[PDB]
Design a protein around this nucleic acid. Structure first.
Lengths: 778, 743
DNA sequence: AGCTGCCAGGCACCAGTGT
DNA sequence: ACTGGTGCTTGGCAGCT
């Protein structure tokens, strides 16, 4: 094995290796003219991942270099491939002109494509958030931060325990997760997509505070309410540095940061989120979820917002009551607003590409199309009687000048890129129109030159054409080649044809090519000028898009409440849930059968229901719908019931061997009289009574000590004695029965199921006999 | 409805629902890569290349290496329902193994599907039991006329070259024949070639094998773990076969334990005999490869040069294998040695006919070796003659002109040419006729160059045509021996399976089980063949003593998988004994076993709204209805999932029935102490248990089976470890005493 | 409409004219 | 040091059919 030496490498590889040294662990697209190339292991790994060929490059001194590459113009196709596989990619471009450059051309990494920092439409998921996130652990606790780089929505939290930290990850579901080398709880993180093991120095608190205050243009972060969250700031700092390092542009759209403090929302553990299937069914998909029923939003940003709302039920009554008002007010105007709102589209993500200076002509056209809907929406919303709605109407904005600007500046349906020109509309720039008229002037001249020359020569096959390689030409067929005029200079030969050039033709070639080149250059300059004109209003536009997205969510939840017959829940002082004709919002929609509605009456005096009765999904649905009604009430939506009075709820536990006892312990430790606890048939014991013993003791603890609002489904008939012994406990039972009755389950229903299951009549009779023997002694 | 790949230039496009369904299945927003994806998911695909469909690949009828799964069977199957019962048929189109059955009830029909697991399932429009088939891959709703009996008998007798099917032992089975007919027509319709490799058909009779229901197959994880994959299965441990066909055979064996003692004893003999020669045979056997599937592509006339090269390579191993196996003392082994064959002429034929490492296709030629055909060699020499002339023409013309950039090249469009660079274009000779101009170069032609172009192109064309003819000639020469070759591949595959099971027995320390007259199982130092391998901890071996006098064991104690493993390993030992393999134990005496029932593991609902507890009681009912004194019954903690007394009452009544009425060999795991009274009341019942050691800060669930009932309850101990408040545990400990002391 | 194969623009390389 | 050929990934499409 030979000894490598940087001085022995060719200037190109010297340049490459110096750049690659800055990105050892990730793939580097070193630009070489029209191709983005890769070398050594990068080439080997790329050829496997991207399904491209692996070749070599010569070196007279040394061994040949593994090579692989792709044309620059098809880069987005391959970035998509790598990003879906969780691979980061460094984009190294050519800076400086090879004509002027003596050695290899100067080459900087201009950006780094990574799963959590993508802002391109083609790589992103329309109705799904894509979050970069950072996670930090301390001797005192955890520190978390997330960033939607396409909206600049930057948040921060400081979970106390891993149970809350696991819930954060479940809820937020980051696409790329930064973490410290010294992270203790790898179990939380291991086997996650987009893992990024960062060095411990990036989570420095003094740099984080410095770097965040720099970004936000503040001297202290007291205003953002994150000043006393150092664990969070350490994560936020690490994240912001990464975000910057990958984009390598200024990130103006990241204006603020927010503490998400647990007391402000209804806490839900990871299991409880999955059991309630809020945005994700138990099988993994999105069908038959609460979101699948509620989300009929017309814009992607609205869809994404509503999903965030569902996972973060707010506890702030002022916010809740304002949503209810807005929902009631907008019910008559849903048909009117929604068609117009639809035309605004995903303005949120368009503005990110504006902020990053990556917005393509279609983005600005869609942005222009969105501005055109604004006067219409303002007209509709003026008559709506709500302070919340009028606030949104105000925040929504009008942007008349910008609407006008883009109407003038860009054509009706522009191309996908500016690269080839044709984006800018005529009349916007006088210099540009002149250059285009010169190009079309030479176009005309050349057309009349064709008919002139074929007349003048008398050769019917005589044509005028253009070749990218050889320029303009006069083509004559093989048969008539000999009759070409003296002044025709042959420029190209084909099998059945000959092509010539004359000074007149060459003169207007130079005319049209310089004209087009001049125009193309001017479009690109005029296009970058639009960014300088629009970006001064970015904060106002970001607010508009936020108003428009929230307006979509509320108009949607207004429409859903009507179309699905929901009612407005009332809030009460004391803990309790009082549902009349309650329904499961998803099950009633997926089943074509009519849903059997049911009541619920939980109060401080009636805390725990022991739900005996047969095995089936009726119990689970009764319990789950109770949670989903509470959840929906606390996102400010209407709820699937005839009437609902609901008191404060601090968190929802939805429990449905040791894994059972751990989850039960989690409930007993963290539950409080403001908690909604849903438990299904715990009591897995080594023997006959040890499961019952714990089932008893937990129920006992949940009723006397914790006093949580508990639905406690069980098969133990022994637990139907709890109301006799304890204050606050009561019996209900489901009697396809599907209707909740007061009192305990009437039959002993195990043998009945065994009969249905097909156990021999003889065997059931001997059980029925044995059952009497057991009951008569006890 | 089939997916359609409408070709649009360089892309195969799809539209409407096809596009929607494709984007989901294929993970799209290189065709053979995606066909493989769809075929494994049981999807048919139409290939549209005028503008019309040239090919349709169907998941159950594929025979191409690139689409198939090397070590996995791929079965087309047909299912028929009748007022009298069910009718089933399956076909491995790559081996021509065609079978037929007539399940009496849906329980047996479900087991067939589970076991066979077809890649593409044909069914009649009037199928009553959708539940059996709904949500399965490769569903194909066929019209009811394809299941006609008179056409089936006609079409089958045509295929097999018989007038009557009495010889195949399927003459009686009309339901099966209806399915078999529907299937054969489909098979033919999509290959649309003669299918010579389909030479027979076979009825399988339940009494000849150990019956296993679907649940029991999945709970024993014979070839498929509970999660769906193939890791941590009995097959994952036993299958260290060197050929794919051997792998696939062994998997079939595991799912079909034979009851025929003669067959079993013959396998045991073969296994014992071959133990010293495993190191020797396996490296050679490996080089035979998947001859089974190569012969299908021969039979279908789709075999590519590499197939025949691999077939030639396989024939070369045969004399070596025959030499090794001659000294082996077994009638069974010598029978395989005979059936294996030698095919000396065919080996020689392919050595002469095809080059060492041929191309992937014949399309471009270069497959046939020189010396095989005199006409071909002449045509090649003429081509190479003009090749030489043109090569010397290059150096001649560049010398004569003095132009160093002067080259001679070839273009499909323009033919041969003399290329000169832009810089030296003006110095081209007068006789050079320019016919193509490039950016930095010019290309010309002369009559001498055009003359030898016609010479080489006609020569090559003549040769290419002759190769393709000589290649198709090889099929005409090989195919007459297809039946003999199919038997060889069958012998080679079975030899691989037995050599493997010989090697596994040694490497994994298995022993030969003995068979006894009366029902029983007597294991010494028994082990779970998978768990002992997956766990890096030492496996605690355990005995078992089940007889007619000791039929049922009530297994109380803590179940933290220790009970399930003790029970599952008992089944897997019985299963392995009855595929003729050695078994994971110090010693095993085993009596006749008619059926294995395994009510173990927690049963996921499939048709929901019926609980977990009913799934247990359904499987329980299946046991009580169908079990017999020759049955091995494994039950895990039934009574669980419903009221304390209700559950105990059934648990009692089932055990009672299984000990007195059925008298099956039963392992009955339970948490009810009350059931530990059964040995006092009933003759053939006894108590065993597992326990846990407690010392200091250490608590360990032991895996050792002890005689007598369980002493203690470890539920509260686990709850303590899990972190349930000390106060809550104390109140449970209090409540537990109250419950136990009353009863 | 269906193929070949030329070309895109980096850069290093090799071979024929430069002391 | 110079000059004018060579090679190299994949995709676009001219130039043939």
């Amino acid at each position: 094995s030979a000894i490598e030496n940087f001085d022995a490498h060719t200037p190109m590889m010297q340049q490459y290796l110096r750049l690659k040294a800055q990105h050892p662990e990730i793939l580097l697209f070193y630009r070489m003219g029209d191709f983005y190339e890769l070398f050594y292991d990068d080439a080997k790994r790329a050829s496997q991942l991207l399904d491209i060929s692996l070749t070599k490059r010569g070196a007279s001194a040394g061994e040949p270099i593994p090579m692989a590459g792709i044309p620059y113009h098809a880069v987005e196709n391959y970035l998509a491939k790598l990003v879906n596989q969780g691979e980061s990619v460094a984009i190294c471009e050519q800076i400086g002109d090879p004509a002027t450059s003596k050695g290899p051309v100067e080459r900087k990494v201009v950006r780094i494509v990574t799963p959590g920092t993508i802002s391109d439409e083609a790589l992103l998921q329309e109705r799904q958030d894509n979050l970069l996130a950072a996670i930090w652990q301390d001797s005192k606790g955890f520190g978390y931060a997330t960033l939607d780089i396409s909206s600049g929505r930057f948040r921060l939290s400081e979970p106390a325990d891993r149970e809350t930290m696991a819930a954060e990850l479940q809820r937020t579901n980051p696409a790329e997760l930064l973490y410290a080398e010294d992270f203790a709880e790898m179990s939380l993180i291991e086997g996650r997509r987009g893992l990024r093991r960062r060095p411990l120095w990036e989570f420095e608190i003094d740099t984080a505070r410095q770097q965040l205050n720099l970004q936000f243009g503040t001297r202290d972060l007291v205003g953002f309410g994150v000043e006393n969250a150092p664990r969070g700031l350490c994560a936020a700092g690490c994240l912001l540095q990464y975000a910057k390092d990958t984009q390598r542009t200024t990130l103006p759209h990241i204006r603020s940061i927010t503490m998400e403090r647990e007391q402000d929302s209804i806490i839900m553990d990871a299991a409880t989120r999955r059991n309630l299937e809020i945005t994700q069914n138990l099988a993994g998909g999105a069908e038959n979820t609460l979101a699948s029923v509620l989300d009929c939003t017309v814009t992607p940003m609205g869809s994404r917002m509503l999903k965030r709302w569902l996972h973060m039920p707010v506890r702030d009554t002022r916010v809740l009551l304002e949503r209810q008002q807005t929902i009631g007010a907008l019910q008559d105007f849903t048909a009117g607003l929604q068609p117009v709102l639809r035309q605004v589209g995903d303005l949120e993500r368009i503005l990110a590409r504006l902020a990053l200076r990556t917005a393509r002509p279609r983005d600005l056209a869609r942005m222009r199309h969105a501005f055109q809907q604004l006067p219409e929406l303002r007209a509709q919303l003026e008559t709506v009687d709500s302070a919340p709605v009028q606030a949104l109407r105000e925040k929504m904005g009008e942007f008349a000048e910008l609407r006008d600007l883009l109407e003038r500046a860009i054509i009706d349906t522009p191309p996908v890129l500016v690269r080839d020109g044709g984006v800018i509309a005529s009349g916007y720039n006088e210099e540009l129109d002149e250059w285009r008229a010169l190009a079309d002037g030479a176009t005309d001249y050349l057309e009349r030159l064709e008919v002139r020359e074929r007349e003048r020569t008398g050769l019917d096959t005589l044509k005028v054409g253009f070749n990218a390689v050889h320029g303009y030409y006069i083509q004559i067929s093989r048969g008539q080649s000999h009759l070409a005029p003296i002044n025709y200079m042959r420029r190209q030969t084909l099998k059945n044809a000959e092509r010539y050039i004359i000074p007149e033709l060459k003169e207007y070639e130079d005319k049209v090519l310089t004209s087009k080149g001049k125009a193309l250059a001017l479009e690109k300059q005029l296009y970058e000028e639009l960014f300088d004109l629009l970006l001064p209003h970015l904060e106002a536009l970001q607010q508009s898009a936020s108003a428009l997205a929230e307006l979509d969510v509320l108009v949607n939840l207004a429409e859903r409440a009507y179309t699905l017959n929901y009612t407005c829940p009332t809030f009460i002082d004391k803990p309790g849930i009082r549902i009349t004709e309650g329904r499961h919002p998803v099950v009633e929609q997926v089943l074509n059968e009519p849903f059997i509605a049911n009541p619920l009456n939980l109060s401080p005096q009636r805390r725990m229901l022991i739900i005996t009765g047969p095995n089936m999904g009726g119990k689970s649905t009764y319990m789950r719908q109770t949670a989903l009604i509470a959840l929906m009430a606390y996102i400010g939506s209407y709820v699937p019931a005839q009437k609902v009075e609901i008191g404060p709820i601090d968190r929802i536990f939805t429990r449905v061997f040791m894994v059972e006892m751990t989850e039960t312990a989690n409930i007993l430790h963290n539950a409080t009289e403001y908690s909604l606890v849903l438990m299904d048939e715990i009591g897995r014991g080594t023997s006959t009574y040890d499961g019952l013993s714990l089932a008893w003791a937990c129920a006992e603890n949940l009723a006397n000590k914790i006093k949580a609002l508990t639905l406690f489904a069980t098969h133990y008939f022994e637990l139907t004695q709890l109301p006799e012994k304890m204050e606050g406990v009561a019996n209900v039972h489901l009697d396809f029965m599907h209707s909740v009755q007061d009192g305990a389950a009437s039959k002993s229903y195990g043998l009945a199921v065994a009969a249905l299951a097909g156990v021999p009549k003889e065997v059931i009779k001997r059980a029925r006999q044995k059952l009497r023997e057991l009951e008569s002694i006890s």
